[PDB]
């Protein structure tokens, strides 16, 4: 069931190559890739959520991603996964994807936005499925013999592997501050803001309405958004809230293993 995703939110992170040979911050980013099965099926973890809408309902034609300070909706038909030649998607839920792929040396993901813009991210990888039996073959035959191997199972029931969710940190946005004649103006736009300026000694505090600081430049000031109402996964790419973490809940990993014959 999808009840475990009720109070969560997506996030942004770092990607080493964004299409042209330069780094960027992207709404879709890669975590570890698991290849423990002997049939050659892969499992992938990303930073967006598939199958759940922005009002906490289930709909299999939609996905939600994190825009600047607010999530939004997008189409599922634009999701693609490719290494060398294109791959084929077998099942999705939440953060996770299943795929079958040819051999290669890279891996790429991408999708299409709600204003018609595309995003990509690329990571290195080495893919070579194992050999079963005493012959090397390229496709499934019509006359043969059966030997054991193992695979992944298409099920979304509760399992014994779990991951945690914590409280999000603050977000520094520079754009809020502006520069006027000999003064600095901070814009709230409906969100709580924390500020600190070094001009004229020190000035610290919180605010909810417009405020003006006298005898100060645009520099020597800092702003951030500091109140949140949702929980988020504790990636090794996002700084900690405090010296000791605050747990709020946990969610499970689908698709366990099993024995089959091939």
């Amino acid at each position, epitope marked *: 069931n999808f009840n475990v995703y009720k109070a969560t939110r997506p996030y942004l992170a770092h990607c080493p190559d964004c299409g042209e040979g330069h780094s960027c911050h992207s709404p879709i980013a890669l975590e570890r890739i698991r290849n423990e099965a002997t049939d050659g099926t892969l499992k992938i973890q990303v930073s967006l959520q598939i199958g759940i809408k922005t009002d906490d309902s289930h709909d299999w034609t939609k996905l939600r991603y994190m825009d600047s300070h607010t999530p939004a909706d997008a189409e599922r038909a634009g999701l693609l996964v490719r290494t060398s030649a294109p791959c084929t998607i077998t099942g999705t839920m939440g953060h996770f994807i299943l795929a079958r792929c040819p051999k290669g040396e890279t891996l790429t993901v991408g999708f299409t936005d709600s204003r018609k813009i595309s995003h990509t991210c690329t990571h290195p990888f080495h893919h070579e499925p194992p050999v079963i039996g005493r012959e090397r073959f390229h496709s499934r035959p019509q006359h043969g013999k059966e030997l054991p191997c193992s695979t992944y199972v298409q099920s979304t029931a509760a399992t014994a592997e779990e991951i945690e969710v914590h409280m999000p940190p603050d977000t520094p946005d520079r754009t809020l501050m502006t520069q*006027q*004649s*000999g*003064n600095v103006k901070i814009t709230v736009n409906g969100q709580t803001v924390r500020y600190k300026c070094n001009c004229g000694g020190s000035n610290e505090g919180l605010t909810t309405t417009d405020k*003006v600081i*006298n*005898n100060c430049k645009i520099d020597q000031c800092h702003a951030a958004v500091t109140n949140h109402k949702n929980w988020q996964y504790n990636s090794p790419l996002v700084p900690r809230n405090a010296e000791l973490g605050d747990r709020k809940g946990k969610i499970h990993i689908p698709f366990p293993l099993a024995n089959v014959t091939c």
Partner: antibody
Amino acid sequence: QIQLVQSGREVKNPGETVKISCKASGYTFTEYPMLWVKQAPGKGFRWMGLIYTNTGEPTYAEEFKGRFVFSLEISASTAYLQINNLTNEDTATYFCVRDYFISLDYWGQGTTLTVSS
Amino acid sequence: QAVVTQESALTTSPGETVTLTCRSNIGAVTSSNCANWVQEKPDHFFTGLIGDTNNRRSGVPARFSGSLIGDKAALTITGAQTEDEAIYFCALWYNNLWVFGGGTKLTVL
């Protein structure tokens, strides 16, 4: 009562220098900036720049990024305006004004500069 | 070069309400321009009236107020008297530098 006191009139010749003062009284000098404005004879006002009383670093406008130099004296609570290498086109009337938040509340009495050959 | 356009003069009668308008030649006036209004004393002295669009200077009586009307900045004065026959100016701030207006004269009959 806040009062701004400026210097008196003076007559100059080309190639000389002139110093215009602006005395401050009634408020703490280092809490607000000092602004300068120029009014040519027969023309409107023109903005030239301001200086931060807390740090002393001045900013100049595009048209006056030249011979003009600003200065401050914290101990005397007085700001100075200096124009060097005077020419006959430099005759005008000058004022000093304070900035309180976004509003230009107060004004000086003005000083008249006459340059002739 | 941006300039602010103002009317030459306005004539009114005692007890009425006077509204003055100014507008720049490069675009509309918005909340971020921080329009300023000052008044020139007949003795060739200057004092400010309206700063930051809708903030009245301390000590200025209740008959002075300002706001933005459409694409033009406006200053409205109620209870006009012969003492109001002065010069009014409009000032606008765009990017690095200020912009000054041409001024106007008030006549009360």
